[PDB]
Amino acid sequence: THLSLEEKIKLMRLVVRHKHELVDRKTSEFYAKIARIGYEDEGLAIHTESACRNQIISIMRVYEQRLAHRQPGMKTTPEEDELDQLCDEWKARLSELQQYREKF
Length: 104
What we know:
Its main location: nucleus. It is a single chain. By secondary structure, the chain is mainly alpha-helical. The protein has one domain (1-104). Helix content is 73%, strand content 0%. It is built from 4 helices and no strands.
C-alpha cells in the first residue's frame, strides 16, 4: 500500500520517538510495535510487521535519493524539512547500532 506524506511523517515521528527501543537482531519486536502504535494512535492502516518495515525502508530509500539530488538554493516546505530531520535521526540510530556490532 501507499502512504501519504502526512502518514509518512506520522510514521517517522513514531519511529524516532521509539528509536532507543530497537535492539540489534530483534527487529521483529520493534517493527511490530511501530505497526501497532501507528494503527492504534495515528490512524494508519493495519500492516503486518513486514509491510510496516517495508514502508520505513522505502521512506529511507527515497530520503537518500532526495539527499543525493538536493541542490543549493532549493526551496523546501516545513513538512519536507521535518521528514528529512526525522530520517536523518533514524539513519543515525541505525548507524550507531551498526558501529556497535562491528567494533565490539
